[PDB]
Write a protein that binds this ligand. Structure first.
Ligand SMILES: NC(=O)c1ccc[n+]([C@@H]2O[C@H](COP(=O)([O-])OP(=O)(O)OC[C@H]3O[C@@H](n4cnc5c(N)ncnc54)[C@H](O)[C@@H]3O)[C@@H](O)[C@H]2O)c1
Ligand SMILES: NC(=O)c1ccc[n+]([C@@H]2O[C@H](COP(=O)([O-])OP(=O)(O)OC[C@H]3O[C@@H](n4cnc5c(N)ncnc54)[C@H](O)[C@@H]3O)[C@@H](O)[C@H]2O)c1
Ligand SMILES: NC(=O)c1ccc[n+]([C@@H]2O[C@H](COP(=O)([O-])OP(=O)(O)OC[C@H]3O[C@@H](n4cnc5c(N)ncnc54)[C@H](O)[C@@H]3O)[C@@H](O)[C@H]2O)c1
Ligand SMILES: NC(=O)c1ccc[n+]([C@@H]2O[C@H](COP(=O)([O-])OP(=O)(O)OC[C@H]3O[C@@H](n4cnc5c(N)ncnc54)[C@H](O)[C@@H]3O)[C@@H](O)[C@H]2O)c1
Ligand SMILES: [Cl-]
Ligand SMILES: [Cl-]
Ligand SMILES: [Cl-]
Ligand SMILES: [Cl-]
Ligand SMILES: [Cl-]
Lengths: 334, 333, 335, 333
C-alpha cells in the first residue's frame, strides 16, 4: 500500500529513523528530508554520530540531495511544512520529528503539501498515540495523523500494561532518570520560559516535567488519570531509566512481579527483560522500546499497604526509534 | 576544647578540617592518619576539584601539615590500633576511612588511646545521629557514634516532618546521587558490587543504600516503614532524594509545603527552597538537607494518595556540616 | 569626574560575571542597565544561580522591568537591535558589549547611536584598538570610543608571548589551547551554522576549533604581527582552559631561564600569575588573573642549533578573563 | 605458537580477546590471570561502557570463563612468577597489567613457563614495535617485546611519514588524551603522581608520557629529536596527537597532506581523513592512527617554518588492533 517516506526534522530522531529503516532492510524508502540547513551539514551529521558511531552505509551529497547507500533523497530547507514539495519525490508518509508541529492541526500542513499520512515522534495532544505492542491494534485504515508519544511513554506503557493486566494499578507515580536532550542548554542561559531548562545539562541533575504519566490514558485507557510523574535529566548522552511506584490491586512478591513481567516480555519485540546488573550505557543501541529490570524490583509492605517499585531501562534515542519504525511499518500497510 | 584526630583524610576527612576552620571551631585538630605522605595530603588539601583553593595556608614537613600556621601530626598506619593518638592527645577520632564502620572495628581507636569515635558513615546498630532530628539522644556515656550517610541526613529531616505533621504509613525512596570514590573511573573490578565496577562518569548506575532501611536508628517510629535505593549519576557532588509515601492524612501540595517550611524555620540543618534550583546550586550548602517545594506532587485516586517529596543535598560539604554540628555537641558531653 | 555608569548588553556567561566582579571589587562603576532578550525574572534566576561559580553573593530580586541587586535597581531592556536600546534613560555611558553579535566597530557604534558614549567589546572585533590589560593598555587614550579586549585565549597568550618576546625574541610560533566548552558549541549533535565541528556534542568530544588569538596577536603585540598561528581543542570541562605555545626563540635557552624570565614578568602583576604547583584546570576556576604561567610544563627540545620552546599558561576563560575586562573597563572609564 | 594467556583482563586485556574473536584469529586464548573472580570478569567482558555488548556468548564457572563456547582458565595470582601458565600451555603472554613493564619484570612469565611476552605498554630499552612502522625488526629469537603506548602508535606512523618525506630535525608533541584507569575518579592519593590524584572526568590534567622521548626505539633516526606530553581530558576514549616539527624541507600544507595520504594508502594500521571529525568518531577505529589533513598548519616567517600535524587514535580499540597485528606476527616467528 505505502512505501515512500518523508522526514521532517533530520535531528537525533530523524537521522536515526533513516538508520533503523535501513538496518532492518525495510521496504519503506526515505525519499525526501526537510530541515533547516545544507545537504553538506546533514550529510556530515548522518555520517558522524556521537552516540552510535559511523553510519553503516555510504553517504554523499549534492547541492539538493543526499545519496545514501547509493540512493538519492531530496533535501529541502523549508521552515514551514506547507512549502515542502512532498509531492515531487512522492512521499506518502511524513515522520514528523521537528518538535514544532505537535498538533493534528499543525501536521495538517503535511497533507496540504500532499502527503497522505503523518506520524509525529512526540506527544501531540488528544490523538491516536501508539506504543507499539501496547495499543497499535487501535490503528485503522482511516487514520491519517498519529503520535508515538515520548521515549518515556514507550518505556512506561509496556511496564504499566503488564502490571495493570496481572495485578491492577490503582494509583502510581513515576520518575525517569533521563539522558539530557536538545531541549536543554549547554551553558546556563535563557531557554524560553522554563527556568530549569536554562541550566547547563551536562553539569547538573535537572528536574523536568514530562507528560508520560499524565497522558498515559491515551495509550492505556484504564489508567487514565491514575498516574503522575516527572524526570531528572542527568549528564549521560543517551540511555535512560524509568521508575514507577504503584499501589497495586493485589498483594505481591518481587518474584511474582518479575515472573509476570518475564511473561509479558517473552517473544515481545518491543519490550525486553533483564536480570543482569546493567547500567545505562548497556541500553545504548537497544532494539526495544523498554527493558524491564528485575534486579530493581522492590516491594515495601506495612500490613495491608504495599508500594511496588518497578524499573525499566530505555534508549530514549535508538530504542524509542525502533518503536517508531514498528508503528510506521504498520501504519504504511493500512 | 577537645582535641581531634581524623582517620582517613579523604573527600570527607579534608572537608571536616575545612568546615572546622570555616566555623572557627574551638576543636583543635591535632592529628590525621591516612596512607600517604604529608606532601600528598598537603597537595590534596590545598587543591580541591569540587570546592576550589583551600581558604588557609597549607604546608607540610616530613611528619606534619602546617595549616594556617598550626601544626597537625600526620601518621600512615593502615591499622587503627597502631595510630599513636596519645602522642598529641587526640581525644575524639573522626573516623572517615570507610574501614571501621562498626563498634567492634572502631574500638581500635579507643584501644589506641582515644576517648570517643564519630564515624562518618552507617555503622550498624549503634547510636546514629542526624543533627536536628535526634541529636538529643546523645549523652555523656556515648563513646562510639555514627552520623549515618549523606542520604540519611537528607532523608531523615524530610521524613521526620512528614511523620510529625501527617504520619507516614509506608514509603520508598530513590536518591539520584553524585558519584563517589566507592565507584570506578573505568570499567573494572570493584569488590563484589558488579554495578560499582562500571565507569561512574559515563553511566546511570543503580546502587544499594541503607538510608531508608535503617532509618529507624534515627526515627524509631519509622522502623521497617521505608525502603529505597540510589541511582548514581555523572555529577561530581550534589544529590537529590525523592520519597514516595502514603501518609496518615489526606493532604494538598500546599499543605505539605507549609508543614515543611515550618520544620525548616530556624533550622540550621534543614533548609527550604521554592526556587527552581538544580544540583550544582546545592554545592557548598551549609544544610544537611534542603526541601524543594517545587517538586512536591500529590497523586490521588479515590481514597488512595501517593505523596512525593524531594530534597537536595550536597553529599560532601552539606553532610559534613551535619557531621561537624554532631561533633561539636559530642565533644562537649 | 570620570564615567561611572555602565550598561551591559548580553547578560550571559560573560555579562553576568561582569556584574559579579564589579560588585566583588567594590568598583565605583555602577551598572545601571542591562539589555538582553528575556524577562527580568529569567535574568534574576540566572544571576542568582550559577552552575560554575555557585550562588550570587548579593541579594537578587526583580520587577517587571528591572533587577534589584544588593538593594540597587538596574533597568532591564529586551531590544534585539542595539540601536533601539534606551541607554539614555538611566544614563548608561559605557556599554560592555557581551552578546557576540556586535563584534566590529561598524556594529558596535549602534550603542553610540542609542545614546552611550563608549563601548567595550568582550571579544575580538576586527582591527580596532584591542587591549590585553598589563600588556598594552598604555595604548588606550581619551579618543578611543570603541575598544575590544580580544578573547580569553588572547588574554592568556599575550602576557606569555610578551614576556618571551621581551626576554628572548619570538621568531615564529604556534599555539594550541585546550579550551573549556562554550555556548557557541552544541549540546547534542545538530546544525550550528556553517562550522561542521561546532555541530557536535560539546560535553562528549574533543573538538578542533578555529581561534584568531594567535593570528591577530599583532593588535596587542605589534612586533609579533603575523608571526603566530594556532587553534583550539574544545573539551568537556565547564570552564578553565590552558594555552600551549611552541616557539622558535631568538636565543638558546634553558627551562629554568624561561621560567625565571616569566616569574619576573609576573611579579607585582595583577593580570598575570605564576605557578610551580601541579595544578589542574579546576584549580584555575575563579582565578583573578587573565593568565597563570605554569613553570612545571615548560619544555625545551633542542637538536644542535634547532630549538623549540613550549610554554604553557592556564586561564579561567570565564572569570579570569572577566577580571581583565574589568581592569580595562576601569581604566577606559577614567581617560 | 598459537596458545596465548592474558595477564590483566582490564580495558586492554578484554579488548585483546574481543579483537582476536572479531578477526577470527587462529590464536587460541587458553588462560587469563587477574585479581578477581570469573563471575566478575564475565560481567565485565559482557558489558562494555565504551564498546557495548560483547558480540559472543559469555558464561563462567568457579575457575573459568566460557566464551563463544570455549573454556578459558582464570587464575588470580598477583605475582606473575606464580601464574600456572603451563597448565593449559599458554606460550605467549599478553602482559596488560601495567605491573611488569620491563624485561626484568616480565621475565617472571618465562620463569612461570611461558615462551614469549608481548607487553601492552612501554617497557624500557627492549624491542618495541609499532606495526607497519618497524614490525620487520621483530626477530625469531625475541622473547620479550613491547608495543609501546597508544600514543606511540599514533605518533610513530605520522612521524615516520614526515621524516621519510621531509626530514624531521626537531619536534614536540602534545596529545589531548582520554582519561584512563591510571587516574582517579575523585581527588585522592594515587602513588606519587600528584596530577594523577585529581578527578579525571572533571579536569584538564597535564600528564607525562614517553611517547616522543622513547621514539628512537621505533624510528632510530628520530632518537633524542622529539619531546612531548599529554593533557588528559574528560572523554572516555578517543584521543588526538599534535606534532609541531621543524622539517628538513620547506613545505605547503597540500604537500604534507599528499605525502601522508601516500603513507596511508593500503596501510591497515594508518588511516587518513579529510573530514571534520571529532573524538567520538574515532571510537572503534581499526587503525592505530588516523592522520587528519584538516588540522595541518604551516607557520612561516622568512626562512623559518613550523609544521603542525595531527592524528586521531582510539587509545583503547585502535591501539588494540595494533597489539593484535603485532601478536599475530610474533606468534609465528
Ligand atoms: N531525543 C530524545 O530523546 C527524544 C525521544 C523521543 C521523542 N523525541 C521528540 O522527537 C522530536 C525531535 O527531537 P530530537 O531530539 O531529534 O530534536 P533535535 O533538536 O535533535 O532535532 C530537531 C531537528 O529539527 C530541525 N528543525 C527545527 N525546526 C524545524 C523546522 N521548522 N523545519 C524543519 N526542521 C526543523 C533542526 O534543524 C533539527 O535538525 C521532538 O519532538 C522530541 O520531543 C525526542
Ligand atoms: N559523598 C561522600 O563522599 C560521602 C558522604 C557521606 C559519608 N561518606 C563516608 O565517609 C567515608 C569516607 O568517604 P570519602 O568519600 O571521604 O572516601 P575517600 O575515599 O575520598 O577517603 C578515604 C580516605 O581514607 C584513606 N584510607 C583508606 N583506608 C585507610 C586505613 N586503613 N587507614 C587510614 N586511612 C585510610 C584513603 O587513603 C582516603 O584518603 C566512607 O565511610 C563514606 O561512606 C562519604
Ligand atoms: N565564554 C567564554 O569563555 C568567553 C570568554 C571571552 C569572551 N567571550 C565572548 O563574550 C561574548 C559573550 O560570550 P558568552 O559566553 O557570555 O555567551 P552567552 O551566549 O552565554 O551570552 C550571550 C548573551 O547575550 C544575549 N543576546 C544574544 N543576542 C542578543 C542581542 N541581539 N541583544 C541582546 N542580547 C542578546 C543572550 O540572550 C545571552 O544572555 C561573546 O562575544 C564571546 O565570544 C566568551
Ligand atoms: N587505556 C589505554 O588507553 C591504554 C592504551 C595503551 C596501553 N595501555 C597500557 O596497557 C596496560 C593496561 O591498561 P588498562 O587501561 O587495561 O588498565 P586497567 O586498569 O583497565 O586494567 C588492568 C587489569 O590488570 C589487573 N591487575 C592489576 N594488577 C594485577 C596483577 N598484579 N596481576 C594480575 N592482574 C592485575 C586489574 O584487575 C585489571 O583488570 C597498562 O600498561 C597501560 O599503560 C593502556
Ligand atoms: Cl523527560
Ligand atoms: Cl548512594
Ligand atoms: Cl543595531
Ligand atoms: Cl577557542
Ligand atoms: Cl598519556
Amino acid at each position: 500500500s505505502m512505501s515512500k517516506v518523508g522526514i521532517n526534522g533530520f535531528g537525533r530522531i530523524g537521522r536515526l529513523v533513516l538508520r533503523r529503516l535501513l538496518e532492518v532492510k525495510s521496504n519503506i524508502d526515505v525519499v525526501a528530508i526537510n530541515d533547516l540547513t545544507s545537504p553538506k551539514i546533514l550529510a556530515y551529521l548522518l555520517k558522524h554520530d556521537s552516540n552510535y558511531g559511523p553510519f553503516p552505509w555510504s553517504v554523499d551529497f549534492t547541492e539538493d540531495s543526499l545519496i545514501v547507500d547509493g540512493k538519492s533523497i531530496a533535501v529541502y530547507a523549508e521552515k514551514e511544512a506547507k512549502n515542502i514539495p512532498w509531492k515531487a519525490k512522492g512521499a506518502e508518509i511524513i515522520v514528523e520529528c521537528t518538535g514544532f508541529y505537535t498538533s493534528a492541526e499543525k501536521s495538517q500542513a503535511h497533507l496540504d503539501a500532499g502527503a497522505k499520512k503523518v506520524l509525529i515522534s512526540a506527544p501531540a495532544g488528544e490523538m491516536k498515540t501508539i506504543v507499539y505492542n501496547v495499543n497499535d491494534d487501535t490503528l485503522d485504515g482511516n487514520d491519517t495523523i498519529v503520535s508515538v508519544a515520548s521515549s518515556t511513554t514507550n518505556c512506561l506503557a509496556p511496564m504499566a500494561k503488564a502490571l495493570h493486566d496481572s495485578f491492577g494499578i490503582e494509583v502510581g507515580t513515576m520518575t525517569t532518570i533521563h539522558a539530557y536532550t536538545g531541549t536543554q542548554s549547554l551553558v546556563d542561559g535563557p531557554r524560553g520560559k522554563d527556568l530549569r531548562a536554562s541550566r547547563a545539562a551536562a553539569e547538573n541533575i535537572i528536574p523536568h516535567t514530562t507528560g508520560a504519566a499524565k497522558a498515559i490514558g491515551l495509550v492505556i485507557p484504564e489508567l487514565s488519570g491514575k498516574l503522575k510523574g516527572h524526570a531528572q535529566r542527568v549528564p549521560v548522552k543517551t540511555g535512560s531509566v524509568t521508575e514507577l511506584v504503584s499501589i497495586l490491586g493485589k498483594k505481591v512478591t518481587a518474584e511474582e512481579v518479575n515472573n509476570a513481567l518475564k511473561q509479558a516480555t517473552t517473544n515481545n519485540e518491543s519490550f525486553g527483560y533483564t536480570d543482569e546488573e546493567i547500567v545505562s550505557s548497556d541500553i545504548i543501541g537497544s532494539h526495544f522500546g523498554s527493558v524491564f529490570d528485575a534486579t530493581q524490583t522492590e516491594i515495601t509492605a506495612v500490613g495491608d499497604l504495599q508500594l511496588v517499585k518497578t524499573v525499566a531501562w530505555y534508549d530514549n534515542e535508538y530504542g524509542f526509534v525502533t518503536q517508531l519504525i514498528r508503528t510506521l511499518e504498520k501504519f504504511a500497510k493500512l
